[PDB]
Design a protein around this ligand. Sequence first.
Ligand SMILES: OC[C@H]1O[C@H](O[C@H]2[C@H](O)[C@@H](O)[C@@H](O)O[C@@H]2CO)[C@H](O)[C@@H](O)[C@@H]1O
Ligand SMILES: OC[C@H]1O[C@H](O[C@H]2[C@H](O)[C@@H](O)[C@@H](O)O[C@@H]2CO)[C@H](O)[C@@H](O)[C@@H]1O
Ligand SMILES: [Cl-]
Ligand SMILES: [Cu+2]
Ligand SMILES: [Cu+2]
Lengths: 370, 369
Amino acid sequence: KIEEGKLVIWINGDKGYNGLAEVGKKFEKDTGIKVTVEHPDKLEEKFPQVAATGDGPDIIFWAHDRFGGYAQSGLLAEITPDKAFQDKLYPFTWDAVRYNGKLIAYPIAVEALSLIYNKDLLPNPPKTWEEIPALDKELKAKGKSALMFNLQEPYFTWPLIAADGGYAFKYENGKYDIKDVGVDNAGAKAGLTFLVDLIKNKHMNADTDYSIAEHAFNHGETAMTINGPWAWSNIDTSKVNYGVTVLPTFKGQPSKPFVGVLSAGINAASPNKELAKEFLENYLLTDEGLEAVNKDKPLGAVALKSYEEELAKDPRIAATMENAQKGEIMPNIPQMSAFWYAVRTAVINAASGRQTVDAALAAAQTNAAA
Amino acid sequence: KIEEGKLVIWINGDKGYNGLAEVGKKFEKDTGIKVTVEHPDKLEEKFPQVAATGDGPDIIFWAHDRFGGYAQSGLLAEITPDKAFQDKLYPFTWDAVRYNGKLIAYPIAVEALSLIYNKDLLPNPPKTWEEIPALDKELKAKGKSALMFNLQEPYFTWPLIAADGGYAFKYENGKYDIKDVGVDNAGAKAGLTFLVDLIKNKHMNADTDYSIAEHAFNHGETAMTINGPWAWSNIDTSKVNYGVTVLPTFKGQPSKPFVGVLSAGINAASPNKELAKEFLENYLLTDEGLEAVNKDKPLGAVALKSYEEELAKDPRIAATMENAQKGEIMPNIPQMSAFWYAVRTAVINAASGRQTVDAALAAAQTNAA
Ligand SMILES: OC[C@H]1O[C@H](O[C@H]2[C@H](O)[C@@H](O)[C@@H](O)O[C@@H]2CO)[C@H](O)[C@@H](O)[C@@H]1O
Ligand SMILES: OC[C@H]1O[C@H](O[C@H]2[C@H](O)[C@@H](O)[C@@H](O)O[C@@H]2CO)[C@H](O)[C@@H](O)[C@@H]1O
Ligand SMILES: [Cl-]
Ligand SMILES: [Cu+2]
Ligand SMILES: [Cu+2]
């Protein structure tokens, strides 16, 4: 079970958990309540397992797409901000955390992937995916590469897969049709085929993951990476002269990243719901609370209107929002976990050459629709 | 082709490359010759590909096991230390880089994996692999795990596989029989099966890699990890109260890590062979040079006698040598790269459940021979 009189928070290890811990220290200084911030592996998978038994964190942070599943499984407390508090956050961010008519988490920030590039190696970033092999040929001659990014998580490859027509679930008449999946269509096939060709022609390696790409970019081994706002801090530290910009187009069309709203849900089994509410509304979701987290690892475009307006002039955030507008907000429906698992397998199997692109996506299509 | 009048060095990203760069800056300061230290991805695969076309770095750092393969391909210059310099290093480290009667690299340091444990979480670490499932169950109740280590590179799982009888190439009377491969015998199958069982029982995850394990240990999420001396610097930084100790036994037998001698080879295509020799003999392989590297990322037990003497009181190094004594120094023969590729595939396939242990090891056996 969950311990009373304190708060346990889970957040992913790529986020500003040290900053969040500082907000927690302030909370403790004011209320005497200890806040423990943890970053378990696979937390988005563990949470539903442990929460069902009445254990786990008081508060879970993740992108909003996971939350409908958690809500449908009875794992989340309905949140009860008054109208005054609601007015403090952008309406579209509340939309991301509304499920079956109820608010099931507090929205924190809007995230989208951008192209990040080393201005020393590449003063002019490429407008198109198609020119990346040419850039890589140039750079390979200097002992570098053009582009490295996490190929192990479909989140990162999705923008390209979606560009020419791939989609998750078709929206119609105000709801997602979970039986209409867009993962094995011509557009999705074109996008994944391009990625696989990049690997076949040795411009990328199938096993490149988050840490490998981050290392390479931050040590100037590769001219570009694809990543979210949380990654800017480590780049700052590495002293690389970087820019953040619109993702490359594919077949003349915008890459379409899936947009996540980082959100904080309260465990239905928590005996500290009021403390969790006070922490989130009166400490984290303030100018100063968001600053503490953002200073650790940037959040993106925060849900709090006041602080968002303050940071909006940041060109990196402008780029983030440009990419977000070109993409689509993720659904929060329970079927999303099945979608992501299916596409994850498809990309890994196609990238490694274990399956053809056609075979991989045909299977994912079926798997995603249950 | 390689640029004349400078030095390009490749070394793995887990080593003290910044320390090495400092030795390089000292070289440039004294000679005007710029030294560029790089740490490319998959450099042990990269080097032979580019060196075959006469490009690549002037100097390549890797464990000695890969060097016999490079030499047979003609990718390395024979090196020419006088006897006075050779006597500066331990004969057994020179043995590791002797191929076809010739010295094909400079030995730098001796590496072996040890068990690293969080003293606060686990004051008395387990002596056996067999007690790990019960330890994990107890720690899981506390929100921790018992053990996380890199399951993606067979280097890290080899000690368990070799514990009860597994081996690469039969070594008899001072010679390796490249036809007598021990990767699919009862011992190796017992070892790998125990590993796969840990995963099946959720005590470990098949996808755990170097970064995941390092993060978990250095943030106190797991009580133990398995790693080499290069890892200690990041643990120091993390403030985890750690100890370095003997690997757990399996079926009553010591884990048997493959011991590596970090070594520096000179590209046969380098136009700077003399500069490279100078940098290596007169700058790197000195108490000051090695200290610079070691202070960045610990080297282990260095090949240079004088400096090894000076660091030998370090209990972490003593534990490293105790594990090394229980293991086996790697062969340097050309067949090693085939051996490693085959075993890596087998461990990953068995761990993921894509193939049975028996089938994975049988394929590796065939591929390695
Ligand atoms: O890759 C599938 C994965 O995508 C998204 O996860 C993102 C997350 O939104 C970001 O905040 C960041 O942490 O990177 C993650 C990808 O590694 C979905 O939110 C997640 O449900 C899904 O499994
Ligand atoms: O995993 C196979 C791999 O094992 C050894 O590589 C070690 C290396 O010796 C250490 O210095 C350290 O870098 O970790 C490596 C494992 O990731 C062999 O030397 C290497 O040939 C082999 O592929
Ligand atoms: Cl819907
Ligand atoms: Cu963590
Ligand atoms: Cu590197």
